[PDB]
Every structure is written in structure tokens, then in C-alpha cells.
Amino acid sequence: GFDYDVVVVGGGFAGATAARECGLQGYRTLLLEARSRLGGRTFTSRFAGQEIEFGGAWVHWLQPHVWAEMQRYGLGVVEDPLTNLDKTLIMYNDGSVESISPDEFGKNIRIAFEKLCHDAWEVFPRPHEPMFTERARELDKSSVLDRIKTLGLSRLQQAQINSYMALYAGETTDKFGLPGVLKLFACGGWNYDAFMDTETHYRIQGGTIGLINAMLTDSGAEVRMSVPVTAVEQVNGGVKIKTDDDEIITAGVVVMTVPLNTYKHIGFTPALSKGKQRFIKEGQLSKGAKLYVHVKQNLGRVFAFADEQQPLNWVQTHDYSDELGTILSITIARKETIDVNDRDAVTREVQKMFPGVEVLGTAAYDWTADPFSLGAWAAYGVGQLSRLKDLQAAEGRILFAGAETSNGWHANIDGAVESGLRAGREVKQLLS
Amino acid sequence: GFDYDVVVVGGGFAGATAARECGLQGYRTLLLEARSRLGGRTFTSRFAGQEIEFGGAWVHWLQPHVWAEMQRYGLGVVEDPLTNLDKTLIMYNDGSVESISPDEFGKNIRIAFEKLCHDAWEVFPRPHEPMFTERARELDKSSVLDRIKTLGLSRLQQAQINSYMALYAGETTDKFGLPGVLKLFACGGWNYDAFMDTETHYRIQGGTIGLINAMLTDSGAEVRMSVPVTAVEQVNGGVKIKTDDDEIITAGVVVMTVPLNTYKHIGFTPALSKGKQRFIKEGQLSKGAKLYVHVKQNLGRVFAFADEQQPLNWVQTHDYSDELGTILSITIARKETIDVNDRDAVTREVQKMFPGVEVLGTAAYDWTADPFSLGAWAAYGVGQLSRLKDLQAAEGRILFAGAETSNGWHANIDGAVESGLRAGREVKQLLS
Ligand SMILES: Cc1cc2c(cc1C)N(C[C@H](O)[C@H](O)[C@H](O)COP(=O)(O)OP(=O)(O)OC[C@H]1O[C@@H](n3cnc4c(N)ncnc43)[C@H](O)[C@@H]1O)c1[nH]c(=O)[nH]c(=O)c1N2
Ligand SMILES: Cc1cc2c(cc1C)N(C[C@H](O)[C@H](O)[C@H](O)COP(=O)(O)OP(=O)(O)OC[C@H]1O[C@@H](n3cnc4c(N)ncnc43)[C@H](O)[C@@H]1O)c1[nH]c(=O)[nH]c(=O)c1N2
Ligand SMILES: CN1CCC=C1c1cccnc1
């Protein structure tokens, strides 16, 4: 006889999918989002008169769960084509900048990536069962750098692939779990071209927030915003949920979809299992930030990688024209390498790559400083993948979702949707 | 004020998915199945002490819609013994058998398939928008054989790829549309290994009928069996449905999911659009059958192609052991090439492929003789794909689904589920 059948904590894709499932099963469903907005680690905004993406945005048809949702709600794709590049750059750890032919750049990144993932089929014949093979468990003792060191790459190739893997980690590659990379590669059909097609090619028609709103409208759930959850208590065959306004909401079941790195901010009674607490203390690796830079010059279509000891790890032209100048889209692997809110430091770092340009504006999202993400995309450290079930496992009447908890595309919208579907099923099993 | 909000004609995957979508939206939903069983062109049965699939059986995680359903209902995969093969054979049109080392066999089929689909990337960059490129439309004037004739393949390679394509066509390859094959290959990540992994490697835990029953139970719809629909009339802002007896059912909308080849047996008032009538007159090509053979000997893990003038076109091990012997799963492209219900002829042909074996049992399903399939899986003839919209288009309050009508994995369970999701969306738009 509680206030709700199910309470979903978190308004990202995982929470929205869980809420849709529970609502269409007829449960009285409430969703609590801590921010004043939905989307979580997806966030569409505007800068310098244009639309920009501060978080995740890109999807693909090889990603099963989000593609099935797009079919359900009749959403197509929007191509970010990019076409030919006018300038490809690599910045080594020592700060030196080298201009390379786009063709040679692509050839070298392909050689390095295919060497890194040469054994994806043998290790992950079932990418959605990461622990299927013993080889996966054995390789979860190795870092991405451990493998890179064995590949006999050239200096250029090594710098390129290390920059790429530091981006995927949001951290230095010596800490990055190797098997998660192989597993993502395998999810893309064990093939370089197919996987690369998923990276930054297609966005959702009507936007991530469009799909989230469609799901939440379909769900019929009550949706309360700016209501952060601070504690969960299991009692009376149910749960009590406290907000930061000391309010109490009771329910038969609760689905947690908050990012792993934020669990520290929530009290649980009874305490969570030891394995879950190990995960909660560890966190996930990524410390990334996103930055858009409006410069006066028209630099055309540019792309640059910077290795892990430098700040501007992924740079690419968002838009360009003589009147506009250029908007640069920049992903920073580790926030600590640059103060994105300092225009003089940002300008110095940008000019290191593009001499003489004048910075007209900046717009940044520091995902590590946001208390409701405390980090960016999901990136497993060494040894974490093989314990992932400890995080996925239900704890009585508390269920757990989120992209970190997915088996497939765990650094993506698709993994969040997967975890939401699973959480819906688990709610149905508990409530019948 | 009709008897139901929505009536779904057909108890296959498309109908079950449409019924699940409609039921979870709260519509009063009825499902009419003409057979005494559910599953349609999937059929879970038993043979030689084991569970078998007489129709569609194999799925994959690169198939978005059915994989998402499997996640929703908590179903894993069941691996058939395709890896590490002990014997790979080719039987040419003349009946001669050539045994090849499994690696050489796989290498040659890969060479032939990727040569056939060398331009899949350029022609189908968006496999779920088949008419996206002009090249796809222009190639829809060509047959699979038209291209095979340009490839200069070796004898083994040509026989392998022609057997594969005659199986997928259910017909001789001179009639098989080229673009649909390129499009399926593209759906499989544009590479042979990944595509082949999606076709005959993994089955559903608990069976196709397990997933069908899960969806239909979730839907809450009424399910009436042995009720064939003979006519549909649009009247009074709804539709009237006549059965084979004196029953009449009124509804706000009806979703037709019966196989294309059976529409000839159904009257429509008003008559359907000219394009849809053209499709209904043409039909689709497939004349396939399925056959399971239990032999006393333990053959291990076997795989064989037979070209189109022979009956045992696709052979692979279902199960094997010293006590059991072997169960062979055999897919026949054209029923007319063998009397699957005559066990002595089946034994003769099996021994033609595997000399000296002793046949303990046979179990077959002739999909072309069933009046409610009149053919097998979906196989497009020349020129049909570029007109597929004519088949997809709603006709007032009648909606059309089924694997033939899907955009992606159209020869598969996944395409059926896709069409069911689409039909759900269209019903929601019509009824609100
Ligand atoms: C910069 C950047 C770039 C990318 C990506 C991420 C980022 C940060 N990703 C990943 C993608 O954005 C991500 O994997 C999913 O959006 C994760 O969504 P979840 O629902 O799992 O968590 P998410 O963080 O979205 O949802 C959690 C929700 O819970 C809320 N919350 C937290 N604590 C709470 C509390 N105590 N009480 C209540 N609510 C609370 C949060 O505010 C948030 O709304 C991506 N993906 C992709 O597919 N393509 C891409 O290109 C990228 N690139
Ligand atoms: C032997 C064989 C083998 C394979 C496959 C098919 C076959 C026949 N396929 C293809 C796959 O099985 C197929 O494409 C879909 O399951 C078709 O499902 P639909 O719902 O579109 O039609 P399907 O034919 O399944 O459903 C239509 C339903 O409508 C009913 N019906 C017909 N007329 C009616 C009437 N007048 N009134 C009422 N009901 C009526 C039928 O009885 C049937 O139940 C496959 N796929 C895959 O993914 N993996 C595989 O391995 C294979 N292999
Ligand atoms: C996997 N699909 C879909 C259409 C027909 C097949 C098939 C392939 C090989 C053997 N039997 C059936």
C-alpha cells in the first residue's frame, strides 16, 4: 500500500526506458531527476548561433536497443557528414605539432586500430556476454597500454592510437581496461569500417531529448525535476526514498540509474553488498570535458588528435564560414589538463595548434564538476569488467541500471537503453 | 463503437509484436490465427528426443528489433555447432561431391560472397533506407545471376555462392533480385563473417514459440485460433472482417500480417491500390522446405552446400554424440527437388551426400503446401525492392506488416518484428 509501484531515480536514457516499460505495464510510476533538465549525459544546447552537443548524441543501426526504439517512435537519422578534411594534425606528448596528409593519417589510424583489436573475435564471440570466454577474464588483467606496447607500431601510429584510447578512457591509457575496448569493437561486427561508422556519423532525428520525451510521454509516469535523491531504505516489503528537501516517497520497488560515480552521495540501508561497494568506491575512469571554441579565422575543415599529456585531445571543425570564422568541437580527456573556463589558457592551447587565431568565444561542459555525473562516459579500469555482474545484480527491492551496467555498448546511449529494458523486466518479476 | 479497437490477422512474429504494442497501449485487441497453432513461418516442434525449429530459428545481436525483444523478455542464445567444423562439402549440380578442408571452404565462400557484394558499401550505406542511393534502384534491374556471371569465379566458389543464393531465393538464382542480397549483407556490417554469423549460428532460448508466447501474454490480447480471415471491408469508419464460417468481427483498424503469397485468398472492399495488387499478384519467390534427419553414425560438426539442381542445399549439424548419432538440419531451396515426406528418397539423397550412413528418422515441413504460407521466407524477385513502398502503404484503416514489408532484415524474424513495431506506431497514430 505504498505511494507508487515503482520509483525511477534518474532522467537519462536508462531511467526513461525503465519508466516507459514500467508505465506500459500499468504500474503507478514516478521518475525523479536531480537536474532541472532531462537527458543526463546527453545535452543539446546552442553556441555562437548554432546547435551543439555537449554530451552523447550519436547512434547507429548496429546498436540494437536504441535502433529498436527509433523504429517504435518513427525516428530517422541525421548525418554529420564532414566529407573531406583540409588539415589533419597530431600533437605528441612533448607539445610538438605535426601536419599529416588526411590520407596518411587515416591509413595509420586504421593500421594501429586493427592491430589493437586483432583478436576481437576470439576473445568476444558474444560481445553481449563479455565473460563468455576465459581469454576475456585473463585479458582483464591487462591495460590498453600493456597491449599497445606489444604492437610494434610506428611513433605516429602509437601516438594516434594512444590519443584515441585516452579519449575512450577519459584517462591515461595505463589505467584503461583492455577488454572493454575489444568488446566494443566486437559489438560493431568485429570490423573496422562498420565500427568506425558508429562513432560520430548519425544523430537522432528530433534529438536525444526528443526520444526521451517520446518515451516518457508514452510511459504515463509522473516526472518530478530538481528532486535529487539522498537516501534509500528497504522496509515493510518496500522502499522509502528521501530527497534533499527531507521529503519521503514510498514504493514497492526503486530503479537506480544514476551514474556510478555519484553513488557516494546516497545513503543505503541496509548497506549494499560488498561487491557493489567496491564498485562504488572505485568509480569509473572517465574525467572528460567538452569545449566549443569560436575563433575569428575561417580554418576550414580540420581534425586533430593530441596525446594524453596534452589538453586538446580531440579537435574537429563543427562549422566554418568567412562570416562565422570557425567553431571547434573539442573533447578533453582529463579535465585537470586545462581550465576550460579560462579564456586565456584556452586561447594559448588553441594557438599551440592553430597559430595566430583569435578566440571570440567559448562554451564548455565539465562533466567531472557536475555533481550529478562526476565524470563522463563509461570507461572501465583494469579488472572491473570481469566483476561487472556485482554491479548489475539486484539488491533486494533496489534495482540498478545505467550504461555502466550494460553488457554491450556501455559507453553509449544504447547501453543505457539496454539496462532500462532489463530493469523493467526485473521490476515486473518482483511485482508480478 | 466496434467489437474491438484493433484486430491483428496473423499469429507470427509480426502479428505478435503488433498485438503486444497495441495491447500495452490499452487498446481492445484481438488476434486471429488461421492455423491451430501460433508461430506462422516459425514452428517449434520435437524430433528424435530434441527440440527443433521447422521454420525460422536463428537470430543475432546485430539484428536490432528481435535482440531488443530478447532483452525485454530475458532470453539468451543457444549455440548450434558451427564453429570448428569436422567436414565441409560441396555438391555440384551434376551430383559430384568435393570435400574441402574447412578453412579452405570458408576462405572460398568468403571470397565469392564478398566479390558478389563488393559494392555493398557504396550502394547501401543506409541498409534501412534501401532506395537511398540511385545505384540500388538501377541494380534492381539485375538478378543475382547477372552479377555472378561477371565475377570469373572458380568452380568451387561459383557453386558455393550459387547454392547460398538459391537457398536465400527459394528458387533458381536467375530469378533472384540482386539488391536485396546486397542490402542484407550491408545489414550484417558489410562483411561476410559477421553476416554469416547472423544466419545459422544462434537460436532463441526457450524457442521462437517461447518469444511469441511471451509477447502475446504480455499483450493481454484475446487470441482466437483456427479462425481464417477471408475478407475485409472498410465501412462505418472502421472495418468488418469475415471469417471462413458465419463469424463477422468489427474493429476500428485491422493489421494484416499474413504472408504476401496468401493475400490472393482474401477479398478487400474497397479494392487495394494498384501497386499493392501488383505485389499480391506477383508474390515472392521462395519455395523452400525444411528437413531434419537422424542418422545412427556420429558425423560430428558438418556443413555442406549443394547447388540449385540438387535437393540438400544447406546442411549443418543440429546435434551429435556417440549415443545419439547425428541430427542434420537441412534447408531445401525448392520443394520440387525432393519428396521430403518419402523417407526412402530422403535416405537415398542423404547417402548421396554421406555414403554409408543409416537413417533412423526424418521429419519435414513443406512450407509451399501449407495454404497459410504458400512459400517460405521472403525472397524478392527482380524489380520488387524498389517498389516495396507500394506494399508498405496503409490502405485507410487497414495496415500492412510482415517480414516482406520490412526495410532491414526482411528474410528474418527481425524484419517481422520491425514491421510489427511499425504497425503499432501506425495504429497509435490512427486511434490516438
Ligand atoms: C561528453 C560525452 C560524449 C559522449 C557521451 C557522453 C559524454 C558525457 N556518450 C555516452 C552517453 O551520453 C551515456 O552513455 C548515456 O547518456 C548514459 O545515460 P544513463 O541513463 O546511463 O546515465 P545519465 O547520466 O544520462 O542519467 C543519469 C541521470 O540521473 C540523474 N541523477 C544523478 N544523481 C541523481 C540523484 N542522486 N537523484 C536523482 N537523479 C540523479 C542525472 O542528473 C541524470 O539525469 C556518448 N554516447 C553515444 O551513444 N554517442 C556519443 O557520441 C557519446 N559521446
Ligand atoms: C523454413 C524457414 C526457415 C527460415 C525462415 C522461414 C522459413 C519458412 N526465416 C524467415 C522467417 O521465419 C520469416 O521471415 C518470418 O518469421 C515471417 O513472420 P511474419 O509474421 O512476417 O509472417 P508469418 O508467416 O510467420 O506469420 C503470418 C501468420 O498469418 C497467418 N495467416 C495466413 N493467412 C491467414 C488468414 N487468412 N487468416 C488468419 N491468419 C492467417 C499464418 O498462419 C501465420 O501464422 C528465417 N528467419 C530468421 O530470422 N532465421 C532463420 O533461420 C530463418 N529461416
Ligand atoms: C537465416 N535465414 C533467413 C532466411 C532463410 C535463412 C536460412 C539460411 C540458411 C539455412 N536455412 C535458412
Side-chain angles (χ1 to χ4, degrees), chain A residues 1-27 29-45 47-81 85-86 88-106 108-140 142-244 246-263 266-273 275-334 336-343 345-347 349-428 430-432, chain B residues 1-27 29-86 88-121 123-239 241 243-263 266-273 275-295 297-322 324-347 349-351 353-396 398-428 430-432:
Chain A
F2 317 104
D3 301 337
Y4 296 97
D5 282 326
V6 48
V7 166
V8 183
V9 186
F13 267 101
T17 302
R20 198 273 317 287
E21 298 291 279
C22 291
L24 293 193
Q25 288 304 298
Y27 302 136
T29 299
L30 165 70
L31 189 142
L32 302 170
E33 166 57 40
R35 300 193 172 88
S36 58
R37 60 173 186 91
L38 302 173
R41 273 172 286 181
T42 70
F43 182 24
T44 313
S45 195
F47 173 63
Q50 306 219 174
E51 176 174 280
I52 47 147
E53 299 283 2
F54 270 132
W58 286 265
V59 293
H60 199 259
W61 43 94
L62 300 171
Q63 290 168 340
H65 312 95
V66 64
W67 195 254
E69 299 298 336
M70 281 144 111
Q71 176 63 220
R72 163 172 288 112
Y73 297 104
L75 305 178
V77 299
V78 189
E79 209 183 335
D80 302 41
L85 266 164
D86 294 304
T88 37
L89 297 175
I90 183 57
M91 186 186 283
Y92 297 94
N93 276 333
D94 74 1
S96 73
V97 183
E98 185 181 349
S99 192
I100 296 289
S101 157
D103 187 67
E104 274 284 296
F105 191 106
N108 284 288
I109 176 77
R110 173 184 206 108
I111 289 156
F113 217 96
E114 283 190 318
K115 250 158 166 174
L116 181 75
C117 299
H118 71 98
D119 61 345
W121 208 301
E122 170 209 334
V123 180
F124 292 107
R126 305 192 200 186
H128 296 262
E129 291 176 64
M131 290 289 99
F132 184 67
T133 68
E134 300 170 68
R135 185 75 181 135
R137 292 165 233 144
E138 170 189 13
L139 280 181
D140 206 17
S142 282
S143 56
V144 173
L145 179 59
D146 287 340
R147 174 159 288 193
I148 289 173
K149 286 167 141 147
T150 78
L151 296 187
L153 303 172
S154 73
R155 172 159 105 107
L156 168 60
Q157 294 160 1
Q158 189 162 183
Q160 277 175 317
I161 191 70
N162 208 80
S163 307
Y164 202 3
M165 296 276 90
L167 282 154
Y168 265 117
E171 255 284 18
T172 53
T173 64
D174 62 309
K175 306 168 167 201
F176 195 25
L178 167 63
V181 178
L182 295 187
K183 191 246 292 177
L184 286 175
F185 187 84
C187 287
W190 309 277
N191 170 264
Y192 176 84
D193 295 310
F195 172 80
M196 278 329 283
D197 207 47
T198 73
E199 272 290 69
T200 55
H201 198 176
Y202 298 105
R203 287 183 312 146
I204 304 170
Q205 176 185 25
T208 40
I209 200 61
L211 180 53
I212 281 173
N213 290 333
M215 299 201 299
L216 286 170
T217 299
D218 193 14
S219 81
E222 170 176 2
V223 178
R224 288 167 56 182
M225 314 270 243
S226 305
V227 181
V229 169
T230 63
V232 186
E233 215 194 278
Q234 297 191 67
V235 298
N236 317 350
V239 302
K240 288 198 253 213
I241 297 115
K242 197 190 271 123
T243 78
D244 60 357
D246 301 309
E247 178 175 10
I248 299 275
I249 304 141
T250 67
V253 166
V254 62
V255 179
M256 320 297 306
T257 82
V258 308
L260 179 52
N261 285 5
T262 71
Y263 271 111
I266 304 162
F268 287 94
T269 88
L272 302 174
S273 65
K276 269 219 187 25
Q277 300 206 251
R278 175 175 188 180
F279 263 95
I280 289 169
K281 165 187 224 203
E282 255 152 26
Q284 63 83 19
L285 282 171
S286 87
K287 307 193 289 197
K290 189 82 201 168
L291 165 69
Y292 286 87
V293 179
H294 179 198
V295 307
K296 185 178 179 117
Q297 289 64 32
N298 179 1
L299 301 175
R301 289 155 306 152
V302 310
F303 177 98
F305 270 157
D307 212 345
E308 60 188 18
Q309 291 179 15
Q310 297 285 333
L312 320 179
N313 305 108
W314 173 33
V315 185
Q316 149 188 313
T317 293
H318 181 75
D319 198 33
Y320 65 103
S321 86
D322 277 9
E323 171 176 288
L324 167 77
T326 320
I327 296 157
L328 296 172
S329 180
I330 308 184
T331 292
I332 291 127
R334 287 183 302 151
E336 68 223 70
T337 66
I338 181 161
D339 177 18
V340 284
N341 302 353
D342 209 24
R343 192 153 298 171
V346 157
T347 292
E349 291 313 313
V350 165
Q351 288 175 4
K352 272 146 175 231
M353 244 168 201
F354 307 99
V357 299
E358 169 176 4
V359 164
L360 301 170
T362 54
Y365 206 108
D366 184 355
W367 290 103
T368 82
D370 198 324
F372 299 122
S373 47
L374 289 176
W377 52 89
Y380 299 123
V382 169
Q384 288 199 312
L385 183 63
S386 33
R387 296 178 284 114
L388 186 54
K389 285 192 165 117
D390 291 352
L391 184 61
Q392 304 169 322
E395 307 258 334
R397 318 224 93 192
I398 310 189
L399 306 176
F400 296 75
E404 280 83 4
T405 80
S406 61
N407 283 326
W409 292 91
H410 64 269
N412 309 73
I413 294 146
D414 184 82
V417 180
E418 170 198 326
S419 67
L421 300 173
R422 175 190 75 223
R425 169 166 35 80
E426 293 185 346
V427 164
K428 218 188 141 164
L430 277 185
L431 300 180
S432 324
Chain B
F2 319 100
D3 308 336
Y4 298 89
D5 288 298
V6 40
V7 171
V8 169
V9 180
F13 269 101
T17 307
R20 198 278 313 289
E21 293 293 278
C22 292
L24 294 195
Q25 296 291 317
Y27 304 131
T29 319
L30 168 70
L31 190 135
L32 305 182
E33 169 53 51
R35 295 189 173 92
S36 50
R37 66 171 178 85
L38 295 168
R41 269 174 291 185
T42 66
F43 187 19
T44 306
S45 200
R46 305 196 58 78
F47 170 63
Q50 269 189 243
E51 208 191 72
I52 59 151
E53 306 271 9
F54 269 128
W58 295 295
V59 298
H60 209 263
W61 46 91
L62 301 174
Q63 292 170 336
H65 317 90
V66 72
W67 191 258
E69 298 306 336
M70 281 160 78
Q71 180 60 195
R72 166 172 291 108
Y73 296 110
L75 308 165
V77 291
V78 182
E79 197 185 325
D80 280 341
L82 277 292
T83 65
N84 304 299
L85 286 166
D86 301 297
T88 51
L89 314 178
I90 181 79
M91 186 191 274
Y92 300 98
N93 282 330
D94 68 348
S96 65
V97 173
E98 212 163 25
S99 182
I100 289 79
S101 107
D103 322 70
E104 278 277 288
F105 192 88
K107 186 223 213 147
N108 279 282
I109 178 55
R110 176 192 294 119
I111 286 152
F113 212 114
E114 303 203 308
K115 273 169 178 261
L116 177 81
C117 305
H118 62 98
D119 57 354
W121 255 107
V123 178
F124 290 102
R126 291 183 199 193
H128 297 265
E129 293 176 72
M131 270 328 99
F132 183 66
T133 69
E134 293 318 283
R135 275 293 280 162
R137 181 176 308 280
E138 175 194 5
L139 284 174
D140 206 22
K141 302 182 271 83
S142 287
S143 71
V144 163
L145 188 54
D146 293 337
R147 170 154 292 182
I148 290 173
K149 272 155 167 177
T150 63
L151 303 179
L153 303 168
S154 73
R155 191 216 268 141
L156 160 69
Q157 290 163 352
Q158 184 163 321
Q160 282 177 316
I161 193 55
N162 204 76
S163 168
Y164 208 125
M165 296 297 102
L167 184 278
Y168 269 79
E171 253 295 6
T172 50
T173 58
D174 59 306
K175 297 158 178 184
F176 197 30
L178 173 62
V181 173
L182 296 188
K183 188 248 284 179
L184 292 166
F185 180 86
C187 288
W190 301 280
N191 80 92
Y192 170 75
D193 290 338
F195 174 78
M196 177 62 157
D197 212 60
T198 71
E199 295 312 279
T200 71
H201 198 179
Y202 297 102
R203 287 184 296 141
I204 304 169
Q205 164 182 54
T208 62
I209 191 67
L211 184 52
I212 290 270
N213 286 339
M215 300 201 302
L216 281 180
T217 296
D218 199 5
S219 80
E222 189 187 338
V223 176
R224 273 236 290 280
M225 303 259 252
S226 306
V227 183
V229 172
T230 64
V232 183
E233 183 184 353
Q234 309 202 60
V235 60
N236 320 307
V239 308
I241 298 186
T243 79
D244 67 346
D245 54 35
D246 310 332
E247 273 247 39
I248 304 207
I249 297 112
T250 65
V253 296
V254 60
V255 175
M256 311 279 336
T257 75
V258 310
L260 180 53
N261 283 357
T262 69
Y263 275 108
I266 303 185
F268 288 89
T269 305
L272 305 173
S273 75
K276 191 158 288 132
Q277 263 170 68
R278 173 172 187 182
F279 264 99
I280 289 169
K281 167 175 162 128
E282 293 165 334
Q284 61 87 28
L285 296 166
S286 70
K287 293 164 177 71
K290 198 139 186 225
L291 166 73
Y292 285 92
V293 183
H294 179 213
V295 305
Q297 289 81 9
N298 182 0
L299 302 168
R301 306 185 163 208
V302 309
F303 190 98
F305 288 128
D307 209 346
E308 66 193 6
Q309 284 173 20
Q310 297 282 327
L312 307 199
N313 295 114
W314 187 297
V315 185
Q316 63 178 58
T317 293
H318 178 85
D319 192 19
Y320 63 104
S321 75
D322 281 328
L324 168 74
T326 317
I327 299 156
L328 300 169
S329 172
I330 304 170
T331 317
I332 299 145
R334 289 187 296 151
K335 166 59 204 52
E336 70 189 276
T337 66
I338 187 180
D339 193 0
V340 279
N341 288 301
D342 175 9
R343 159 152 162 201
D344 318 287
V346 174
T347 295
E349 295 287 351
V350 171
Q351 295 178 317
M353 209 160 249
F354 299 99
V357 299
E358 180 178 343
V359 166
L360 307 178
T362 72
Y365 202 100
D366 171 12
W367 290 100
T368 73
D370 192 335
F372 300 116
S373 46
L374 293 173
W377 50 86
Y380 298 132
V382 172
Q384 286 195 302
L385 183 65
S386 45
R387 302 177 351 243
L388 202 62
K389 271 169 187 154
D390 294 357
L391 181 56
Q392 291 167 334
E395 312 257 347
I398 314 176
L399 311 169
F400 292 80
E404 282 80 348
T405 78
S406 58
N407 286 310
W409 292 92
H410 68 261
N412 309 81
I413 295 156
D414 183 83
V417 175
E418 179 203 316
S419 80
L421 298 173
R422 184 182 73 229
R425 174 167 28 89
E426 292 180 344
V427 168
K428 206 199 173 145
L430 263 169
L431 306 190
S432 299

